[model samples]
Target: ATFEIVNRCSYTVWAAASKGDAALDAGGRQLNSGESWTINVEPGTNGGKIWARTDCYFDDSGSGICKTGDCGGLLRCKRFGRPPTTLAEFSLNQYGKDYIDISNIKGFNVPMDFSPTTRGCRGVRCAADIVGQCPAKLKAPGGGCNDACTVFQTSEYCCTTGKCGPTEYSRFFKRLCPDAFSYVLDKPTTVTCPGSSNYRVTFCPTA
Candidate 1:
């Protein structure tokens, strides 16, 4: 399958992803406004994800950090980004379908749009400006907002006990991105497509 990542905002966005079997670079690319990159990968089940880093500064040696979603202070991410960053996860060709979701269970840094580009499928998105309306208790250090699980570290919010329910904290995110993973066991956010030829992910599609 393929991923057509687009930068629809006014600023630059550093894209990152996890390597699949026939693993591509999965990281290290600067997409200017209106620009895009097509990432090709081998067909497989769940084991990969994609995200964007903002306010980054990497020198010639590629040693620098980002304001949000910093991954090991490296230009090319070898793992998932730090908390408070938007995430697009996928399980390709699982059960004869493409499973996908825009997860904010960690938090959100930017607005995004995820949809199947190759065929008929429902569109899933988290396009609200969560950072602008972040509650004081949920704010992250560098910027953006963090989920209650990260902020409180309590079983009630983290759902570690397996009997947790939504609190006001989870509601905040759910109000903004209802289709996003606002907390653990957030199955309502899950969506599926026909395992299209490629998926389109746009950063800040509303901006």
Candidate 2:
């Protein structure tokens, strides 16, 4: 009847099929890239047997090393089950470069299944505590909370009171602007710019 093939690999594949042993005795034709083909079969004249094969170059190989499955390696053969009302199914997991084949089958069915191979951070709790501890170089001008200061100078460095360090403040430069190299303070303050300010503290790449 009709047969449909689906590609489950990350890379493209080539396929080809023929009727009998001498149908393409010289050489078979290659299937189009990322495409499927359907052919009409004769009832009782041509023996109703079709030989098919696929080129595998993206899945894992059985050798344990990982290489393309040999296109001319072997042929996977199948006999037509019951003619007009018969259905056959098959799957393949290849590595490197390889080829697969199916023959003499009627209605072919393929299922969709896949899972991502990578992982990343998830959940709100994980993001709530990214930066928990403040640095040790930020402090009020006179060691009080009312000083209107920019950043602690090296000479005025203080670390015994859980203050933000110059290193930490420097890290906030790039976070302010993605395209810019540096960030400028809108207004000098000793409170390290509240975390809720319009220009909240951030980190950047360049400056």
Candidate 3:
């Protein structure tokens, strides 16, 4: 599947993606407002995560730290980034289906739209102003909201025991962004598309 990532925020964003050790786009790229990057995912790619890093300062050698979604403080990430990030999760060519979704389980730093470009598949948009309304206990130090599981580390919020349910914190996020996966064991948010479908991820999307 071909994935296009666009940045529509008023500021810059550094995009990152990972498929195990396979770093899409060489792990990361700087995307100023209105810029976009394209990535190609081979068949059978699973459990891949894409996200944007904000408020970053990288030196000439491509090393820096991001206020949100920092991955080892490196401009080129080799693994999953830090929390307080909006995630675009994708699994291509999985048993003849392409599964994709917008997840705020890690947290929300930017509004996002994860949509398919073909096959009339439904898209998921999470454009709520969650940062401003974040509960104090669930707020990240840099910016954006933190997931209850990340903050409390309890079995209830983290769902580590597979015997957990939604909490007020998860409900807060769910009410704002119904399409996004708000917690680990939340309702079905994954959207399945045809294997041939291409997809797009828009950051800080409007409407």
Best candidate per TM-score, number?
3
**Lowest lDDT block of 10, candidate 2:** 121-130
lDDT of 3 by residue, 1-207 (tens): 778989999999999888756676577889999999997767678888889999999999988899999888888787888899999998888898989898888999988998998875899999999999999998898988999888888889888889888889999999999999988888989998888688889998894
lDDT of 3 at 142: 91
lDDT of 1 by residue, 1-207 (tens): 878999998889888777433224557577888999998756764766778888899999887999887778888777777888888888887778888889888789878998888776777899998998999988887888988888788889889889888789888989888889888876677777786447888999885
> Cα deviation of 136 in candidate 3 (Å)?
1.3
- Candidate 2 per-residue lDDT over residues 26-131, each given as its tens digit: 1222334344444322222233232222232332332111111122332221222111111111111123211111211121111111111113211000011112
**What C-alpha lDDT values do all the predictions have?**
0.81, 0.23, 0.88
State which candidate, 1 or 3, has the greater lDDT.
3
For residue 135, give model 2's deviation from the true position in Å.
Answer: 56
Worst 10 residues of 1 by lDDT: 19-28
Give the higher-lDDT candidate: 2 or 3.
3
List pairs with backbone clashes in candidate 1: none
User: Candidate 1's C-alpha lDDT?
Assistant: 0.81
